[PDB]
Ligand binder design. Structure first.
Ligand SMILES: [Cl-]
Ligand SMILES: [Cl-]
Ligand SMILES: [Cl-]
Ligand SMILES: [Cl-]
Ligand code: NA
Ligand code: NA
Ligand code: NA
Ligand code: NA
Ligand code: NA
Ligand code: NA
Ligand code: NA
Ligand code: NA
Length: 129
């Protein structure tokens, strides 16, 4: 599923991301835009053989099982395919674990390079939340 901006913002808010660990909703929407272009089915292979999955491009090296990332962990205890669902629950729940792990949203390289320090509220402007 490819979400619209406000549609995803609303879904993220319902799933508890608004100000989760101090990150306002615009941060999460901005991250999703640059990570996946709001597409729940997005996958991208990393140089190390791991793969990033879903709206927040969650990495198989640490967070989910895809059966083809040798020596990896599955810290969210989920198959990576669950991260591609039209239902974002699995992605949100796993993102909460990631963002709580010490480095905050710096886990998402696109967030660090493209969202951090920017007017992230613009991503939710005009949305009936
Ligand atoms: Cl915001
Ligand atoms: Cl990740
Ligand atoms: Cl694996
Ligand atoms: Cl933080
Ligand atoms: Na689609
Ligand atoms: Na914070
Ligand atoms: Na993609
Ligand atoms: Na894909
Ligand atoms: Na992989
Ligand atoms: Na997803
Ligand atoms: Na995801
Ligand atoms: Na795994």
């Amino acid at each position: 599923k490819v979400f619209g901006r406000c549609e995803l913002a609303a879904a993220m808010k319902r799933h508890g991301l608004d100000n989760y660990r101090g990150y306002s909703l615009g941060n999460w929407v901005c991250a999703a835009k640059f990570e996946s272009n709001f597409n729940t089915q997005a996958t991208n292979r990393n140089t190390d053989g791991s793969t990033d999955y879903g709206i927040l491009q969650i990495n198989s090296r640490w967070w989910c099982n895809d059966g083809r990332t040798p020596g990896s962990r599955n810290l969210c205890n989920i198959p990576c395919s669950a991260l591609l669902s039209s239902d974002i629950t699995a992605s949100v729940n796993c993102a909460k674990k990631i963002v709580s792990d010490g480095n905050g949203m710096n886990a998402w390289v696109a967030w660090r390079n493209r969202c951090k320090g920017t007017d992230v509220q613009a991503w939710i402007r005009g949305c009936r939340l």
